[PDB]
Motif scaffolding. Structure first.
Motif, PDB file in Angstrom:
ATOM      1  N   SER A   1      42.975  32.389  53.787  1.00 20.58           N
ATOM      2  CA  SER A   1      44.180  31.873  54.440  1.00 20.58           C
ATOM      3  C   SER A   1      44.971  32.993  55.107  1.00 20.58           C
ATOM      4  O   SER A   1      44.821  34.166  54.764  1.00 20.58           O
ATOM      5  CB  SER A   1      45.072  31.192  53.399  1.00 20.58           C
ATOM      6  OG  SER A   1      45.375  32.075  52.328  1.00 20.58           O
TER       7      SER A   1
ATOM      8  N   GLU B   1      48.116  33.371  54.936  1.00 20.52           N
ATOM      9  CA  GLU B   1      49.124  33.751  53.954  1.00 20.52           C
ATOM     10  C   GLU B   1      48.618  34.803  52.982  1.00 20.52           C
ATOM     11  O   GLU B   1      49.365  35.685  52.554  1.00 20.52           O
ATOM     12  CB  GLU B   1      49.607  32.529  53.158  1.00 20.52           C
ATOM     13  CG  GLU B   1      50.354  31.465  53.952  1.00 20.52           C
ATOM     14  CD  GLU B   1      49.436  30.404  54.544  1.00 20.52           C
ATOM     15  OE1 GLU B   1      48.207  30.655  54.682  1.00 20.52           O
ATOM     16  OE2 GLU B   1      49.950  29.305  54.868  1.00 20.52           O
ATOM     17  N   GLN B   2      47.358  34.680  52.595  1.00 21.74           N
ATOM     18  CA  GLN B   2      46.759  35.632  51.671  1.00 21.74           C
ATOM     19  C   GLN B   2      46.527  37.012  52.280  1.00 21.74           C
ATOM     20  O   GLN B   2      46.809  38.027  51.641  1.00 21.74           O
ATOM     21  CB  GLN B   2      45.433  35.100  51.144  1.00 21.74           C
ATOM     22  CG  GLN B   2      44.872  35.958  50.029  1.00 21.74           C
ATOM     23  CD  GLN B   2      43.528  35.476  49.545  1.00 21.74           C
ATOM     24  OE1 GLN B   2      42.846  34.700  50.228  1.00 21.74           O
ATOM     25  NE2 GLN B   2      43.139  35.921  48.349  1.00 21.74           N
TER      26      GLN B   2
ATOM     27  N   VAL C   1      36.472  31.013  49.894  1.00 24.44           N
ATOM     28  CA  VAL C   1      36.054  29.873  49.081  1.00 24.44           C
ATOM     29  C   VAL C   1      34.947  29.016  49.703  1.00 24.44           C
ATOM     30  O   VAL C   1      34.970  28.715  50.896  1.00 24.44           O
ATOM     31  CB  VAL C   1      37.251  28.962  48.765  1.00 24.44           C
ATOM     32  CG1 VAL C   1      36.881  27.945  47.687  1.00 24.44           C
ATOM     33  CG2 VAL C   1      38.457  29.793  48.366  1.00 24.44           C
TER      34      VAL C   1
ATOM     35  N   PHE D   1      32.800  25.401  48.728  1.00 28.95           N
ATOM     36  CA  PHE D   1      32.662  24.236  47.866  1.00 28.95           C
ATOM     37  C   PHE D   1      31.275  23.617  48.008  1.00 28.95           C
ATOM     38  O   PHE D   1      30.774  23.450  49.120  1.00 28.95           O
ATOM     39  CB  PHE D   1      33.708  23.173  48.227  1.00 28.95           C
ATOM     40  CG  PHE D   1      35.126  23.542  47.864  1.00 28.95           C
ATOM     41  CD1 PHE D   1      35.418  24.129  46.649  1.00 28.95           C
ATOM     42  CD2 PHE D   1      36.173  23.277  48.737  1.00 28.95           C
ATOM     43  CE1 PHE D   1      36.721  24.458  46.320  1.00 28.95           C
ATOM     44  CE2 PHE D   1      37.478  23.604  48.411  1.00 28.95           C
ATOM     45  CZ  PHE D   1      37.749  24.189  47.201  1.00 28.95           C
TER      46      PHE D   1
ATOM     47  N   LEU E   1      33.200  34.537  41.898  1.00 27.56           N
ATOM     48  CA  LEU E   1      33.506  33.760  40.690  1.00 27.56           C
ATOM     49  C   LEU E   1      33.147  32.291  40.912  1.00 27.56           C
ATOM     50  O   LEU E   1      33.530  31.690  41.916  1.00 27.56           O
ATOM     51  CB  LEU E   1      34.981  33.888  40.303  1.00 27.56           C
ATOM     52  CG  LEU E   1      35.434  35.218  39.674  1.00 27.56           C
ATOM     53  CD1 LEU E   1      36.876  35.134  39.163  1.00 27.56           C
ATOM     54  CD2 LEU E   1      34.496  35.659  38.554  1.00 27.56           C
ATOM     55  N   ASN E   2      32.484  31.691  39.930  1.00 29.47           N
ATOM     56  CA  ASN E   2      32.055  30.306  40.066  1.00 29.47           C
ATOM     57  C   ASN E   2      32.647  29.375  39.024  1.00 29.47           C
ATOM     58  O   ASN E   2      32.960  29.789  37.906  1.00 29.47           O
ATOM     59  CB  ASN E   2      30.533  30.234  39.985  1.00 29.47           C
ATOM     60  CG  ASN E   2      29.853  31.107  41.019  1.00 29.47           C
ATOM     61  OD1 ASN E   2      30.338  31.252  42.144  1.00 29.47           O
ATOM     62  ND2 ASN E   2      28.726  31.699  40.643  1.00 29.47           N
ATOM     63  N   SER E   3      32.786  28.107  39.396  1.00 34.19           N
ATOM     64  CA  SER E   3      33.308  27.106  38.480  1.00 34.19           C
ATOM     65  C   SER E   3      32.685  25.749  38.739  1.00 34.19           C
ATOM     66  O   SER E   3      32.647  25.287  39.873  1.00 34.19           O
ATOM     67  CB  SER E   3      34.823  27.001  38.620  1.00 34.19           C
ATOM     68  OG  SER E   3      35.347  26.108  37.652  1.00 34.19           O
TER      69      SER E   3
ATOM     70  N   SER F   1      32.561  25.356  42.781  1.00 33.67           N
ATOM     71  CA  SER F   1      33.317  26.143  43.748  1.00 33.67           C
ATOM     72  C   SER F   1      32.963  27.597  43.486  1.00 33.67           C
ATOM     73  O   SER F   1      32.815  28.019  42.339  1.00 33.67           O
ATOM     74  CB  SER F   1      34.821  25.948  43.589  1.00 33.67           C
ATOM     75  OG  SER F   1      35.312  26.597  42.437  1.00 33.67           O
TER      76      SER F   1
ATOM     77  N   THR G   1      34.168  31.376  44.713  1.00 30.98           N
ATOM     78  CA  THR G   1      35.170  32.169  45.411  1.00 30.98           C
ATOM     79  C   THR G   1      34.828  33.653  45.449  1.00 30.98           C
ATOM     80  O   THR G   1      34.699  34.295  44.402  1.00 30.98           O
ATOM     81  CB  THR G   1      36.565  32.003  44.786  1.00 30.98           C
ATOM     82  OG1 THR G   1      36.870  30.611  44.658  1.00 30.98           O
ATOM     83  CG2 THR G   1      37.615  32.673  45.660  1.00 30.98           C
TER      84      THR G   1
ATOM     85  N   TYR H   1      47.323  29.219  48.049  1.00 31.53           N
ATOM     86  CA  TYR H   1      46.849  29.404  49.414  1.00 31.53           C
ATOM     87  C   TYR H   1      46.205  28.121  49.957  1.00 31.53           C
ATOM     88  O   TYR H   1      45.453  27.448  49.247  1.00 31.53           O
ATOM     89  CB  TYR H   1      45.843  30.559  49.437  1.00 31.53           C
ATOM     90  CG  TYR H   1      46.459  31.873  48.994  1.00 31.53           C
ATOM     91  CD1 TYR H   1      47.680  32.295  49.516  1.00 31.53           C
ATOM     92  CD2 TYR H   1      45.840  32.675  48.036  1.00 31.53           C
ATOM     93  CE1 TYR H   1      48.250  33.486  49.125  1.00 31.53           C
ATOM     94  CE2 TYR H   1      46.411  33.874  47.632  1.00 31.53           C
ATOM     95  CZ  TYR H   1      47.616  34.274  48.183  1.00 31.53           C
ATOM     96  OH  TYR H   1      48.195  35.468  47.780  1.00 31.53           O
TER      97      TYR H   1
ATOM     98  N   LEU I   1      43.570  27.020  47.112  1.00 23.75           N
ATOM     99  CA  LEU I   1      43.314  28.010  46.086  1.00 23.75           C
ATOM    100  C   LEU I   1      44.575  28.375  45.303  1.00 23.75           C
ATOM    101  O   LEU I   1      45.582  28.747  45.886  1.00 23.75           O
ATOM    102  CB  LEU I   1      42.750  29.255  46.753  1.00 23.75           C
ATOM    103  CG  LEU I   1      42.289  30.323  45.789  1.00 23.75           C
ATOM    104  CD1 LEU I   1      41.114  29.746  45.021  1.00 23.75           C
ATOM    105  CD2 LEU I   1      41.892  31.550  46.553  1.00 23.75           C
TER     106      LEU I   1
ATOM    107  N   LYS J   1      45.462  31.108  42.745  1.00 19.55           N
ATOM    108  CA  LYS J   1      45.022  32.293  42.013  1.00 19.55           C
ATOM    109  C   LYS J   1      46.090  33.249  41.466  1.00 19.55           C
ATOM    110  O   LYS J   1      47.239  33.304  41.932  1.00 19.55           O
ATOM    111  CB  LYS J   1      44.000  33.091  42.830  1.00 19.55           C
ATOM    112  CG  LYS J   1      44.607  33.956  43.935  1.00 19.55           C
ATOM    113  CD  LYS J   1      43.562  34.803  44.685  1.00 19.55           C
ATOM    114  CE  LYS J   1      42.817  35.786  43.776  1.00 19.55           C
ATOM    115  NZ  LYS J   1      41.494  35.240  43.323  1.00 19.55           N
TER     116      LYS J   1
ATOM    117  N   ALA K   1      39.758  26.346  35.579  1.00 19.47           N
ATOM    118  CA  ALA K   1      40.225  27.694  35.871  1.00 19.47           C
ATOM    119  C   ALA K   1      39.260  28.712  35.285  1.00 19.47           C
ATOM    120  O   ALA K   1      38.646  28.465  34.247  1.00 19.47           O
ATOM    121  CB  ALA K   1      41.611  27.903  35.310  1.00 19.47           C
ATOM    122  N   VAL K   2      39.098  29.843  35.968  1.00 18.57           N
ATOM    123  CA  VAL K   2      38.259  30.923  35.451  1.00 18.57           C
ATOM    124  C   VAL K   2      39.155  32.116  35.175  1.00 18.57           C
ATOM    125  O   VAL K   2      40.044  32.432  35.967  1.00 18.57           O
ATOM    126  CB  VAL K   2      37.145  31.349  36.438  1.00 18.57           C
ATOM    127  CG1 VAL K   2      36.056  30.260  36.526  1.00 18.57           C
ATOM    128  CG2 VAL K   2      37.713  31.705  37.817  1.00 18.57           C
TER     129      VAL K   2
ATOM    130  N   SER L   1      40.620  26.280  42.074  1.00 16.72           N
ATOM    131  CA  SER L   1      40.820  25.658  43.367  1.00 16.72           C
ATOM    132  C   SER L   1      40.651  24.157  43.270  1.00 16.72           C
ATOM    133  O   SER L   1      40.025  23.661  42.327  1.00 16.72           O
ATOM    134  CB  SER L   1      39.806  26.214  44.347  1.00 16.72           C
ATOM    135  OG  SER L   1      38.514  26.137  43.767  1.00 16.72           O
TER     136      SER L   1
END
Lengths: 211, 444, 221
Positions: A120, A122-123, A132, A134, A159-161, A175, A177, C129, C148, C150, C175-176, C185
């Motif tokens: 983003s 903003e980030q 990211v 998905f 990192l995964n989830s 997801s 990231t 974000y 996101l 974070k 969450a991780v 996210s």
């Protein structure tokens, strides 16, 4: 104290099917209970005294057993039967619980819908750059994701989830990231996300260019 | 015969209005008498405990005046009985059963003033005797007295008015009308032949005396134990076992009361002075224990709520138990005027409680509360010794208002009467009447 | 009949915290209350029980004053004090009313439970974000969006779309944890015509750091 071991830790069964889970006891027990726990919610007393159904529990649900072996059974399983089942015994003190059994809705294979997102605006303003990706609504759960910066592979900062099985389509989602520093992110152009899943020998690639 | 049966059915439940009205008058008199008696006793225990303050400095003088007071009251009692009405000695219930069997006289002109002032002495003196005996006997004799005063004839009137007066007496002793009615139709009535006793008249009398009781004892209970917990099915067996214990103890306790009755007759050989003095000694011993360890003396009603709540220790329970078995035996067997119902309620409670405690530590998975076993056992001794379970169960029920413990209570009380039979023993009141009646022969 | 337990949250190791359980909708008095806990990704484990008059209180075979279960029938509230908190104490805590059928007691009604986190890590607010379509420009019946969340600590964060009016096609990942910080996210898939035209807002909330943010997902320039 009595050790209750539930025979199947995880099992999958398509709707309309006799599903049976075991609850073995280290010693002798009697009038075991069963609790249903749906992801994110509190346990609910389902079956008690070995075979009595709690008010509101569908007749497709039954339980039986004796001595040192008990079992819960579901005649023609429905979609709302997916949850984790815990057995419990207070025939001896102190009471104990089973390891639980995870009941998952087996279904028709589905390929993942891959969507990739750039950091983003903003980030970046704060020296961070999370990319990211998905991988939505796929089945089975097994899936591999590979990142590629400017065609080169990357495994650091990833990192995964995974979500739990969905209550409507019974698919899974993941997801991934990739977090980098704004300086690292800015010295490269091509960022690709590669998804490898059973539904295909050739991975599903999604990408974008900073330019 | 079928024609006779038909005639009787068609003529069933038609009690002469005169008998009914006299049952009402009896009930009223018995009730008033029981109230007066209870108040006099309370007043005496009060005065006595009031003297201990006017002499609260010199401890030995305390342990002295407690004894002297109790001795003088006990002596006055034994005297009044041994000198005027020998029959007013002990419970009085056997004698009344005898009268129902037309095998024993009802000398009310003697028993009424003797049993009343006599019991007043012994109860007011702190002895381990209940009001049940004195009130039931005074009741019966009141019934005979009214029968004679209106010269009513026929077996029925004689049998009915005698039985109602007895029931109302029991009612007014425990504020338990149902227990009072059930006692007559399970124990008092002739157990082997038909009888012309009108239940409805007994009813009227009991109601009347219970109302007299309420007029003078509003807003209080004899035994407030509150609402205890429930009893799961898988805990019922525990109440069976406890009944078996009462069952083995029931006969044994009966052997002891009768034995001690004989053994103490030896000490004085029937001599009125050695008797009055022996009684004075037991009485004084009670007034003494009535200060040092109160839970070993008195009626026992006081220690019931406490024991049921679990406020006593196991050791304290065993101590209280043994001490009370001894003082109860010593007081009743001595021929002193008083009942044995309440002392047995106390013993049953204590034993029941101890059992509950043990059970609790042995079965945490049962989520037990010792008090339920105290209530279940409270009437178990009445079930194993007197062998009138239904009356005990209903009395306890009426006093502890914990109807959800009904099944355990019945299970416990039944186990006791089952185990008491297969270990021999006899209905203690029946054994006593059988004794008086046997001693009435072989003396010819 | 409701059991609402509170008090949970972040606590430093060796410190102590008091969990509460407000009961309502029945006579609290005739009931035995009990505490049970579930460590993350693990099984259930009984903590202890307490009778109506507090005359009886039993615990799991765990030493001494590690647990102190109490109750206040006047406020119909159950309490659990934990001391010398260590990592094994990090878990979801459930209060439960107890009852029985034949007599072999069970956990009648359970509560939603309170989460307890044992850590020395400090409470950190999250950074939200917006995740816009990257280049697209690629109209299809389904367009997938998201946001996101974070760098926050500790749990939890609630994420909803359009104040919850948008419940279908929503996916909120677990969450991780990494470097003492949580990251998660949420993805929402909607019909292509609808998103550019109207507002698709992501609402994140992290009560711990007193944070509430609504991020409006807007196309990339």
């Amino acid at each position: 104290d009595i050790v209750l071991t539930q025979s199947p830790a995880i099992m999958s069964a398509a709707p309309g099917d006799k599903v049976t889970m075991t609850c073995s006891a280290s010693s002798s027990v009697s009038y075991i209970h069963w609790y249903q726990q749906k992801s994110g919610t509190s346990p609910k007393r389902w079956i008690y005294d070995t075979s009595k159904l709690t008010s509101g529990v569908p007749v497709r649900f039954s339980g039986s057993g004796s001595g040192t072996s008990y079992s819960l059974t579901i005649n023609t399983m429905e979609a709302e039967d997916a949850a984790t089942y815990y057995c419990q015994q207070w025939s001896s003190h102190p009471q104990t619980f089973g390891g639980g059994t995870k009941l998952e809705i087996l279904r028709a294979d589905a390929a993942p819908t891959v969507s990739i997102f750039p950091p983003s605006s903003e980030q970046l303003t704060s020296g961070g750059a999370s990319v990211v990706c998905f991988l939505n609504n796929f089945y089975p759960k097994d899936i591999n994701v590979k990142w590629k910066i400017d065609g080169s592979e990357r495994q650091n900062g990833v990192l995964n989830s995974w979500t739990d099985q969905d209550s409507k389509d019974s698919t899974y989602s993941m997801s991934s990231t990739l977090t980098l520093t704004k300086d690292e992110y800015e010295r490269h152009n091509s960022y690709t996300c590669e998804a490898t899943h059973k539904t295909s020998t050739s991975p599903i690639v999604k990408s974008f260019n900073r330019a | 015969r079928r024609r006779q049966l038909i005639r009787q059915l068609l003529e069933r439940d038609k009690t002469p209005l005169a008998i009914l009205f006299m049952a009402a008058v009896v009930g009223t008199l018995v009730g008033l008498a029981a109230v007066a008696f209870d108040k006099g006793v309370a007043w005496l225990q009060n005065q006595r405990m009031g003297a201990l303050v006017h002499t609260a400095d010199n401890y030995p003088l305390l342990l002295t005046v407690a004894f002297l007071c109790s001795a003088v009251l006990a002596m006055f009692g034994y005297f009044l009985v041994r000198k005027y009405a020998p029959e007013a000695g002990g419970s009085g219930i056997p004698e009344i059963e005898g009268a129902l069997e037309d095998q024993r006289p009802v000398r009310w002109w003697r028993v009424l003033p003797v049993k009343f002032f006599g019991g007043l002495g012994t109860l007011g003196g702190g002895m381990v005797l209940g009001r049940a005996g004195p009130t039931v006997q005074i009741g019966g004799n009141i019934g005979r007295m009214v029968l004679d005063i209106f010269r009513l004839k026929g077996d029925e009137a004689r049998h009915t008015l005698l039985a109602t007066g007895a029931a109302a007496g029991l009612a007014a002793a425990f504020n338990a009308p149902l227990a009072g009615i059930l006692f007559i139709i399970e124990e008092m009535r002739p157990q082997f032949r038909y009888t012309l006793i009108s239940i409805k008249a007994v009813f009227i009398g009991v109601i009347m005396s219970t109302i007299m009781y309420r007029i003078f004892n509003h807003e209080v209970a004899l035994i407030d134990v509150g609402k205890l917990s429930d009893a799961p099915l898988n805990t019922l067996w525990l109440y069976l076992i406890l009944g078996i214990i009462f069952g083995i103890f029931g006969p044994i306790f009966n052997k002891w009361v009768l034995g001690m009755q004989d053994l103490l007759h030896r000490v004085h050989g029937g001599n009125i002075t050695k008797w009055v003095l022996m009684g004075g000694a037991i009485g004084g011993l009670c007034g003494l224990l009535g200060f040092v360890a109160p839970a070993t003396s008195g009626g026992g009603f006081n220690l019931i709520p406490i024991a049921t709540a679990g406020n006593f220790s196991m050791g304290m329970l065993v101590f209280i138990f043994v001490a009370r078995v001894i003082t109860t035996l010593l007081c009743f067997s001595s021929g002193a005027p008083g009942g044995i119902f309440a002392p047995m309620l106390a013993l049953g409670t204590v034993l029941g409680t101890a059992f509950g405690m043990v059970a609790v530590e042995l079965f945490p998975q049962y989520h037990l509360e010792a008090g339920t076993f105290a209530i279940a056992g409270m009437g178990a001794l009445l079930a194993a010794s007197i062998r009138a379970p239904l009356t005990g169960i209903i009395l306890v029920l009426e006093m502890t208002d914990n109807y959800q413990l009904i099944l355990p209570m019945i299970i416990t009380g039944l186990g006791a009467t089952l185990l008491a039979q297969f270990t021999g023993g006899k209905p203690l009141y029946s054994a006593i009447l059988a004794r008086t009646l046997a001693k009435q022969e072989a003396e010819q | 009949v409701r059991l609402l337990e509170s008090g949970g949250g972040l606590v430093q190791p060796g410190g102590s915290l008091k969990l509460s359980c407000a009961a309502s909708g029945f006579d609290y008095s005739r009931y035995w209350m009990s505490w049970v806990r579930q460590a993350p990704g693990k099984g259930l484990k009984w903590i202890g029980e307490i009778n109506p008059v507090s005359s009886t209180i039993n615990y799991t075979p765990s030493l001494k004053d590690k647990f102190i279960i109490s109750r206040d029938n006047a406020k119909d509230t159950l309490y659990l004090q934990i001391s010398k908190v260590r990592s094994e104490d990090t878990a979801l805590y459930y209060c439960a009313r107890l009852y029985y059928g034949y007599g072999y007691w069970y956990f009648d009604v359970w509560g939603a439970g309170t989460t307890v986190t044992v850590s020395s890590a400090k409470t950190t607010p999250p950074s939200v974000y917006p995740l816009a379509p990257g280049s697209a420009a690629a109209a299809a019946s389904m367009v997938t969006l998201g946001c996101l969340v974070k760098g926050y600590f500790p749990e939890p964060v609630t994420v909803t779309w359009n104040s919850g009016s948008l419940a279908a096609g929503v996916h909120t990942f677990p969450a991780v944890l990494q470097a003492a910080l949580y990251t998660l996210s949420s993805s929402v898939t909607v019909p292509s015509s609808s998103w550019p035209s109207e507002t698709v807002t992501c609402n994140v909330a992290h009560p711990a750091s007193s944070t509430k943010v609504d991020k409006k997902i807007v196309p990339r320039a």
